[PDB]
Amino acid sequence: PVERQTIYSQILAAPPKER
Amino acid sequence: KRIVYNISSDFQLKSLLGEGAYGVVCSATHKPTGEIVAIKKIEPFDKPLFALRTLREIKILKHFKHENIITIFNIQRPDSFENFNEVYIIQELMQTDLHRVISTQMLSDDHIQYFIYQTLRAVKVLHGSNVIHRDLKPSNLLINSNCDLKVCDFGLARIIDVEFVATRWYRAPEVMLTSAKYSRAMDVWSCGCILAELFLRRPIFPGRDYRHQLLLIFGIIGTPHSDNDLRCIESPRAREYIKSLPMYPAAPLEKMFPRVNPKGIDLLQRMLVFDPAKRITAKEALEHPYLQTYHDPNDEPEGEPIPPSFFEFDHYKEALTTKDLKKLIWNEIFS
Ligand SMILES: [Mg+2]
Numbered sequence: 108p109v110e111r112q113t114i115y116s117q118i119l120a121a122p123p124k125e126r
Numbered sequence: 127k128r129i130v131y132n133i134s135s136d137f138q139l140k141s142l143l144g145e146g147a148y149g150v151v152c153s154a155t156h157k158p159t160g161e162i163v164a165i166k167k168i169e170p171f172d173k174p175l176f177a178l179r180t181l182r183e184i185k186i187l188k189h190f191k192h193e194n195i196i197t198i199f200n201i202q203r204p205d206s207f208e209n210f211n212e213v214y215i216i217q218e219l220m221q222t223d224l225h226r227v228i229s230t231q232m233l234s235d236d237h238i239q240y241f242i243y244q245t246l247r248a249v250k251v252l253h254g255s256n257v258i259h260r261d262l263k264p265s266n267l268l269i270n271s272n273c274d275l276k277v278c279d280f281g282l283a284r285i286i287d288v289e290f291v292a293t294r295w296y297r298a299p300e301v302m303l304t305s306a307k308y309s310r311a312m313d314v315w316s317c318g319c320i321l322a323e324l325f326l327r328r329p330i331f332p333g334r335d336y337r338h339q340l341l342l343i344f345g346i347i348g349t350p351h352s353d354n355d356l357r358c359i360e361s362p363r364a365r366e367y368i369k370s371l372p373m374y375p376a377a378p379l380e381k382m383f384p385r386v387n388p389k390g391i392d393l394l395q396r397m398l399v400f401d402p403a404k405r406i407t408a409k410e411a412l413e414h415p416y417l418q419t420y421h422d423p424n425d426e427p428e429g430e431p432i433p434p435s436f437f438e439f440d441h442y443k444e445a446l447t448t449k450d451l452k453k454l455i456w457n458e459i460f461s
């Protein structure tokens with residue numbers, strides 16, 4: 108069932124070694 | 127400030143992730159499973175251009191099941207055509223994008239190889255499926271914390287066989303100069319601009335306007351002048367225009383990229399070539415020495431040709447009305 112919702116407003120790992 | 131989403135009570139909005147011309151996107155939790163998703167709310171029917179871009183995006187994301195192309199989970203089905211005013215797309219939530227990464231992270235050569243490798247792997251499956259993206263840039267390459275990279279933003283895409291762009295910094299020179307604006311080669315050029323940006327940590331060709339953009343490009347790859355250099359430009363007016371610009375010989379890339387991996391510079395030279403026919407392909411780039419750490423010819427999907435009719439609307443010139451656009455999206459959602 109669709110209802111209305113309201114909202115009010117206001118780490119990168121190393122790349123894999125081998126494929 | 128006040129954002130309303132009329133969606134399934136199974137979702138609970140978490141936070142506002144972005145507000146663009148297209149509409150807004152929020153992270154959300156699917157209560158039953160606890161899974162987190164991104165939910166895009168689009169109101170495209172009073173903005174024709176965005177309705178058409180949204181249609182291309184939906185069709186392409188729904189079609190592909192590839193590791194380097196954004197996954198769409200579902201699209202809300204509206205209950206009545208009459209009150210169909212919003213489009214809700216539920217897709218995977220990505221952490222950031224390459225633009226933000228280049229601006230804030232110290233990247234190693236390994237990071238660079240991995241990111242350009244994933245970008246090209248996506249381009250290969252698209253090109254092999256007769257899809258050309260046509261607007262590749264760092265902000266369209268979404269990234270997660272484990273470095274997975276996924277292409278999105280297929281609003282200017284076309285099926286092979288004027289327009290507006292946010293920026294032309296990543297557009298091929300022949301695209302700017304001629305009617306050949308729908309080639310696989312234009313995407314490889316953009317990838318070359320992205321690779322260069324990864325090395326420089328700033329855009330390599332940030333033109334201030336149309337003429338200046340070409341001046342910056344030619345100031346690096348050399349201004350085409352000879353009949354051979356210009357053989358690829360069919361239009362005489364285009365060749366004359368090029369000949370009216372300041373003319374300089376190519377600049378030595380090694381000087382520009384002193385501390386860069388020689389293999390990366392070689393790959394870049396093969397992508398940033400004026401003649402599209404001499405530009406390296408996505409498939410060939412994947413087999414290039416610079417990407418040997420990640421290349422696996424048994425795991426780089428070739429794609430399957432999609433017929434032009436997939437984007438049939440692109441082949442009709444009758445004016446489209448608001449209702450026609452609603453019908454195109456409606457039909458796609460339900461079929
Ligand atoms: Mg909108």
